[PDB]
Design a binder for this molecule. Structure first.
Ligand SMILES: N[C@@H](CCC(=O)N[C@@H](CS)C(=O)NCC(=O)O)C(=O)O
Ligand SMILES: N[C@@H](CCC(=O)N[C@@H](CS)C(=O)NCC(=O)O)C(=O)O
Ligand SMILES: [Zn+2]
Ligand SMILES: [Zn+2]
Lengths: 217, 217
């Protein structure tokens, strides 16, 4: 079956996992354990990084038979294409492309300060700007059931992940955007999504690696 | 005609520009000037950031009639889809997806240290690792004329940009990979690309913004 390599954490593999489950894909997981500080030993991965036959060795990676893939968004499109979740109309594809990258940006913005030793200092400013960021997603979604349009796409997994990570960071952050909350309900309401969230496989934390100042555990 | 907003620099708009020219697309450019230090006044853009009707106000952006787009990779796919340069076969799309993101990573890696005030100190390490990064691209391309396969795709523009930025940073960097040099020859060898490189429109520098430590001018 398919095999998804990644750290023994949520991180970037989250949306993928969620996607794999929703698509009822058959897959295994090669979770890599990172050593404790101050070393943060990553040999478990490095002693296999270049033996998997990946073109650009990295985490996460996906191995589907002869197909060795890296880069989260690439892995998602790969899985999505097999289930027509990459968009169909012209406008659908545009929205998918924009979000695919937008979420990636917002995700890093968060991860940047969370990995920053001076995290406690930067937090006040980040929170001040967050409402605006969230608002943007709200404006974008509008009265649509999903982000791409009427049909769910892989970007809905990416958007969810981001929004979830934020209700976790600042719980009240979503209160001002009812439609976004409905999105989360609607998303977590999906059959296979709900079932998986209740299974032993569900790994919502640690949000980041051990090197993080926040969500490291 | 189409309109491409961005800073009065190379940056992320480079590959786009290159793509637009090769596609013989009709377009204008809304270059935004950033103020000198220590303020780096960005008012010229901020006083118009939210009036363009962009979903996620950002630079670069592309306006094609009713279509307002942001996110470099999104803009590229938009332009590419109009000219069938987004890939066709399954393997083609995979490669496109991987590179589309890989290049973005390598580009930031460069941009990160060049914007880092302690640039001179980090440089030795970055150069030590670069050969391997380059090697990967070499390994990937192989005997193929283009990265996606036999046909040129928008990623060849993204890969070129990255490679170019590095021969500029470290000229001898490519000497060890002849196939990558042939790629640059073959790319700058394209009729519309060559013509554009010789026109008044060509803007190879500044590589980055004024806030940069390297390639700021
Ligand atoms: N754009 C890449 C970024 C991947 C990346 O930097 N992954 C980090 C984890 S978030 C990693 O630990 N990679 C393993 C390594 O650097 O060897 C993606 O989406 O896969
Ligand atoms: N992932 C984005 C990066 C966008 C970005 O941060 N662009 C810079 C220049 S490289 C910018 O000036 N953005 C305007 C802003 O965020 O105000 C893309 O490819 O569009
Ligand atoms: Zn990470
Ligand atoms: Zn930039």
């Amino acid at each position: 079956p398919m095999i998804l390599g990644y750290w023994d954490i949520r991180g970037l593999a989250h949306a993928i996992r969620l996607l794999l489950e929703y698509t009822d894909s058959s897959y295994e997981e090669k979770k890599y354990t990172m050593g404790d500080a101050p070393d943060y030993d990553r040999s478990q991965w490095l002693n296999e990084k270049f033996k998997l036959g990946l073109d650009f060795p990295n985490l996460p990676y996906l191995i589907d038979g002869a197909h060795k893939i890296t880069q989260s968004n690439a892995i998602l499109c790969y899985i999505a294409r097999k289930h027509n979740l990459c968009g169909e109309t012209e406008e659908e594809k545009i929205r998918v492309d924009i979000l695919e990258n937008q979420t990636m940006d917002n995700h890093m913005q968060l991860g940047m300060i969370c990995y920053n030793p001076e995290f406690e200092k930067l937090k006040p400013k980040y929170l001040e700007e967050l409402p605006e960021k969230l608002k943007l997603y709200s404006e974008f979604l509008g009265k649509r059931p999903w982000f791409a349009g009427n049909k769910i796409t892989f970007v809905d997994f990416l958007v969810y992940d981001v929004l979830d990570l934020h209700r976790i960071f600042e719980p009240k952050c979503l209160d001002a955007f009812p439609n976004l909350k409905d999105f989360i309900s609607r998303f977590e309401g999906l059959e296979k999504i709900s079932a998986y969230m209740k299974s032993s496989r569900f790994l919502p934390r640690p949000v980041f690696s051990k090197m993080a100042v926040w969500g490291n555990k």
